[PDB]
């Protein structure tokens, strides 16, 4: 018998103290990391449940272990809600993460060595979209594509590359692009050469769910997404598809298991189920709208203050600030802002003269501050403080003043009340 | 977002399914060798706010700001993993055992390299070479199994090693009840300059308690899950000892940015506390009971006339070959399930049936032991199992046994 009262506090002081400090840090810091958010206590409740004790390999109704009658219901709920929210007729909720979800797609549709057309990392693409240090770049033949001098995808050049290299798959999606991708146009290009159009909408899933950003589901053969970014759910992956054959769906299911994973995390999947339900609320829709609005408000300030915003603006939740002309590395800016309790992340920019760990820019996202209560007024004021720090990056007095101002606005907008 | 938000009043359907699973875990005797009951401390960590943090990279060398505290959490997990197993290297980021293994493969091998791994039907894991897994698809797998006696023949293993000259030899299993000679395998590996990779997922808890030989000092790399006999959260772990800085750098890179993205910090916090609990003296006596209970159950099965692969067990599990009884593992599994005895169908050496059907069942004692069962209860339970298997079509027999397990389950609650 394990007493339900056993806790970390009176048993592991070291670990507990670290956890409590992170809890406070989430309240005292303005999080502007585009890929982060604040999941609801409902999601955390699911993740802390006893579903963690169950091994449930296989799929609902067709498992490899006995006693899965109830976890089957849990997984089916996640599957059904994922389909209804995005308008898909197929969904796999078992991927442990976005990376695992993508790995499943690659291995289900391609053979090692096949040619793939994906967005280059510095230009906004994700590691799993072709980076040579990731499994994607190591196992497949990657042909990259980037953005214009205007900061947008040139579908004309994309078509040229597609026709010239004849890739077996074309990847649409990004980790740091602020524009709207024309999914239908990419599908056309893919069809012209008989390639698969794979769209990774991890970053914009929440926006797509609210109708604030074009849904790729009806244009791509396969779609993947994480459940922890703009979707504001638990950390995990998800695979979606529409209008595919039963064979295609069977391959996708097999690629996830027993192809690339073992037992799924049922407690996390329960979290996905409730998060997908919350994403159906009307308030979730107005939330995503504020997210997009706040991102625009912040861009205005940055431009007025004389900073280079890649693509000149944003149509989603994020934007990149190119610091090359300011003679600053993303690493420096990140550290300086951090001292003012403003947390962002250094980020490569198109044609970045520095390596990924250093970079010449920072990425800014509004999902967290918006979920926290911020609106345009607060977002604009915040962008101003950021520029004040960047202007006098070496003035300790400036950083101190800003820090006090953020600790202040943070106290008025608690994350978890 | 208000702290008072919860699932019960907002999502009745999900909550109802969760509550039923909660009750099921109390009313069922779980004998699935790979399952256990993690402590409320681990669940508490997994339900924390650490789930909100992106922390790619390693402590002190992250790709995002604001990782001062999650860094402490991960370092705690790393340090305790090293001390518990006597390793000088540990990676706590793998999302699972499969991801941990994938990292090892990609760090040490090139697609197409030859690998010597234990065949699935004979006790090996999917990631040890199965053709339906990434391991069998990306690499050239040469399999090895067990004797007619049910044990690994190191003489045959050495022959295969010398003949195929594999770049890596995998030691480890998902359904083998014996003791593997790690040192002997290292010798074989050295004779051909191959890497000895040991996946100790199933016996990690036993190894931690000293009840089973530790492979860490013999293998070049070791992996394990944290949710089986180690009784922690679901996740993977990589360990090593005496390797070079270069080897360790490769392993770290293989995990990230090689095969994963952001780690699950809330789960890692769970790993940290679970590893601390595994250091308790009571944990050691617990693993001992686990081994003892497994033996007590095997005796009964043999007396009752059932075939136990390998004729016995030296760990927490054992396989029951049902070929001679004209039963499929799928049938036995379903019958036992109706009596609230949960096991899992399992392939057996030279199984005439496919993996979804099988001709056997695997039995493990970690769960019932963690629940309070001792030899007496374990023996009585094995008896009930045989009663069901004997009269697999007698609903009256199944009903009587069911009443009995519900009865004993009430005396040994899992969580209170
Ligand atoms: N465009 C873009 N931004 C993003 C991501 C991405 O995938 N794409 N990330 C998505 O999570 C995070 C950054 N993750 C990265 C992690 C490792 C490497 C990398 O290339 N590392 C090499 C070289 C490092 C060095 O500079 O010394 C390596 O580890 O060998 C790059 C980005 C956040 N920003
Ligand atoms: N020896 C052993 N036992 C184990 C495992 C293992 O890896 N090895 N598992 C570790 O988790 C679970 C069983 N998992 C398995 C999952 C899929 C297949 C498999 O080969 N499936 C093929 C064919 C299925 C069929 O029979 O129709 C497939 O999916 O195509 C086998 C075992 C439990 N028992
Ligand atoms: C487009 C995209 N795809 C997949 C992933 C992988 O997810 P996991 O971290 O759960 O593996 C990410 C994560 N990107 C993190 C960031 O942009 O900061 C992503 O941005
Ligand atoms: C030896 C071994 N290795 C790796 C894994 C992979 O773990 P994940 O399920 O977390 O990916 C397992 C799981 N085996 C489950 C079972 O034996 O029933 C295993 O037994």
mmCIF file of N, CA, C and O and ligand atoms in Angstrom, chain A residues 55 57 65 261-263, chain B residues 34 96-98 101 125 127-128 173-174 199 201-202 225 227-228 362, ligand 4:
data_model
loop_
_atom_site.group_PDB
_atom_site.id
_atom_site.type_symbol
_atom_site.label_atom_id
_atom_site.label_comp_id
_atom_site.label_asym_id
_atom_site.label_seq_id
_atom_site.Cartn_x
_atom_site.Cartn_y
_atom_site.Cartn_z
ATOM 1 N N UNK A 55 0.495 -0.112 -19.298
ATOM 2 C CA UNK A 55 1.176 -0.382 -20.561
ATOM 3 C C UNK A 55 0.012 -0.677 -21.499
ATOM 4 O O UNK A 55 -0.839 -1.525 -21.187
ATOM 5 N N UNK A 57 0.298 -0.934 -25.403
ATOM 6 C CA UNK A 57 0.776 -0.940 -26.777
ATOM 7 C C UNK A 57 -0.320 -1.393 -27.728
ATOM 8 O O UNK A 57 -1.157 -2.228 -27.379
ATOM 9 N N UNK A 65 -1.722 -5.915 -24.390
ATOM 10 C CA UNK A 65 -1.790 -6.200 -22.957
ATOM 11 C C UNK A 65 -3.254 -6.239 -22.537
ATOM 12 O O UNK A 65 -4.103 -5.629 -23.185
ATOM 13 N N UNK A 261 8.016 3.754 -31.644
ATOM 14 C CA UNK A 261 7.794 3.919 -30.217
ATOM 15 C C UNK A 261 7.390 2.610 -29.571
ATOM 16 O O UNK A 261 7.089 1.630 -30.250
ATOM 17 N N UNK A 262 7.385 2.606 -28.245
ATOM 18 C CA UNK A 262 6.977 1.428 -27.511
ATOM 19 C C UNK A 262 5.627 1.767 -26.918
ATOM 20 O O UNK A 262 4.694 2.100 -27.644
ATOM 21 N N UNK A 263 5.516 1.711 -25.597
ATOM 22 C CA UNK A 263 4.247 2.021 -24.972
ATOM 23 C C UNK A 263 3.957 3.510 -24.947
ATOM 24 O O UNK A 263 4.859 4.322 -24.756
ATOM 25 N N UNK B 34 6.082 -5.950 -17.223
ATOM 26 C CA UNK B 34 6.605 -4.609 -17.451
ATOM 27 C C UNK B 34 5.882 -3.485 -16.719
ATOM 28 O O UNK B 34 6.233 -2.317 -16.889
ATOM 29 N N UNK B 96 11.476 7.533 -23.661
ATOM 30 C CA UNK B 96 11.095 6.152 -23.408
ATOM 31 C C UNK B 96 12.264 5.213 -23.632
ATOM 32 O O UNK B 96 13.360 5.639 -23.978
ATOM 33 N N UNK B 97 12.008 3.922 -23.446
ATOM 34 C CA UNK B 97 13.044 2.936 -23.657
ATOM 35 C C UNK B 97 13.376 2.866 -25.132
ATOM 36 O O UNK B 97 14.536 2.720 -25.493
ATOM 37 N N UNK B 98 12.362 2.987 -25.986
ATOM 38 C CA UNK B 98 12.566 2.936 -27.434
ATOM 39 C C UNK B 98 13.405 4.106 -27.928
ATOM 40 O O UNK B 98 14.267 3.937 -28.791
ATOM 41 N N UNK B 101 17.018 3.647 -26.836
ATOM 42 C CA UNK B 101 17.710 2.694 -27.700
ATOM 43 C C UNK B 101 18.016 3.302 -29.059
ATOM 44 O O UNK B 101 19.091 3.089 -29.617
ATOM 45 N N UNK B 125 13.626 -7.775 -27.309
ATOM 46 C CA UNK B 125 12.672 -6.687 -27.462
ATOM 47 C C UNK B 125 12.580 -6.225 -28.905
ATOM 48 O O UNK B 125 13.499 -6.456 -29.695
ATOM 49 N N UNK B 127 12.985 -3.397 -30.280
ATOM 50 C CA UNK B 127 14.112 -2.559 -30.672
ATOM 51 C C UNK B 127 15.431 -3.305 -30.725
ATOM 52 O O UNK B 127 16.481 -2.693 -30.919
ATOM 53 N N UNK B 128 15.382 -4.623 -30.559
ATOM 54 C CA UNK B 128 16.596 -5.432 -30.600
ATOM 55 C C UNK B 128 16.749 -6.137 -31.941
ATOM 56 O O UNK B 128 17.481 -7.119 -32.053
ATOM 57 N N UNK B 173 16.754 -8.126 -22.714
ATOM 58 C CA UNK B 173 15.593 -8.902 -23.110
ATOM 59 C C UNK B 173 14.292 -8.327 -22.550
ATOM 60 O O UNK B 173 14.302 -7.473 -21.652
ATOM 61 N N UNK B 174 13.174 -8.815 -23.078
ATOM 62 C CA UNK B 174 11.857 -8.394 -22.622
ATOM 63 C C UNK B 174 11.164 -9.590 -21.986
ATOM 64 O O UNK B 174 10.265 -9.424 -21.157
ATOM 65 N N UNK B 199 20.618 -3.459 -22.800
ATOM 66 C CA UNK B 199 19.329 -2.844 -22.509
ATOM 67 C C UNK B 199 18.814 -3.580 -21.275
ATOM 68 O O UNK B 199 18.311 -4.698 -21.392
ATOM 69 N N UNK B 201 16.324 -2.607 -19.257
ATOM 70 C CA UNK B 201 15.006 -2.084 -18.901
ATOM 71 C C UNK B 201 14.228 -2.927 -17.890
ATOM 72 O O UNK B 201 13.754 -2.415 -16.879
ATOM 73 N N UNK B 202 14.096 -4.219 -18.157
ATOM 74 C CA UNK B 202 13.343 -5.079 -17.258
ATOM 75 C C UNK B 202 13.942 -5.343 -15.888
ATOM 76 O O UNK B 202 13.210 -5.426 -14.909
ATOM 77 N N UNK B 225 14.552 1.663 -18.914
ATOM 78 C CA UNK B 225 13.367 2.480 -18.786
ATOM 79 C C UNK B 225 13.309 2.729 -17.282
ATOM 80 O O UNK B 225 14.005 2.069 -16.514
ATOM 81 N N UNK B 227 10.250 2.887 -15.678
ATOM 82 C CA UNK B 227 8.930 2.461 -15.225
ATOM 83 C C UNK B 227 8.641 0.978 -14.998
ATOM 84 O O UNK B 227 7.494 0.612 -14.732
ATOM 85 N N UNK B 228 9.637 0.114 -15.111
ATOM 86 C CA UNK B 228 9.355 -1.297 -14.887
ATOM 87 C C UNK B 228 9.734 -1.671 -13.461
ATOM 88 O O UNK B 228 9.112 -1.201 -12.518
ATOM 89 N N UNK B 362 3.110 -14.176 -20.431
ATOM 90 C CA UNK B 362 4.247 -13.772 -19.620
ATOM 91 C C UNK B 362 3.708 -13.345 -18.248
ATOM 92 O O UNK B 362 2.680 -12.669 -18.156
HETATM 93 C C1 LIG C 4 14.189 -4.502 -23.009
HETATM 94 C C2 LIG C 4 13.215 -3.431 -23.329
HETATM 95 N N1 LIG C 4 13.711 -2.327 -23.922
HETATM 96 C C3 LIG C 4 12.990 -1.222 -24.306
HETATM 97 C C4 LIG C 4 11.589 -1.182 -24.091
HETATM 98 C C5 LIG C 4 10.953 0.063 -24.591
HETATM 99 O O1 LIG C 4 10.272 0.882 -23.661
HETATM 100 P P1 LIG C 4 9.132 1.889 -23.921
HETATM 101 O O2 LIG C 4 7.831 1.032 -23.929
HETATM 102 O O3 LIG C 4 8.995 2.915 -22.842
HETATM 103 O O4 LIG C 4 9.502 2.484 -25.249
HETATM 104 C C6 LIG C 4 11.012 -2.299 -23.467
HETATM 105 C C7 LIG C 4 9.583 -2.337 -23.210
HETATM 106 N N2 LIG C 4 8.930 -3.515 -23.068
HETATM 107 C C8 LIG C 4 7.545 -3.619 -22.648
HETATM 108 C C9 LIG C 4 7.207 -5.049 -22.280
HETATM 109 O O5 LIG C 4 8.144 -5.862 -22.163
HETATM 110 O O6 LIG C 4 6.015 -5.360 -22.104
HETATM 111 C C10 LIG C 4 11.799 -3.444 -23.075
HETATM 112 O O7 LIG C 4 11.266 -4.508 -22.501
#
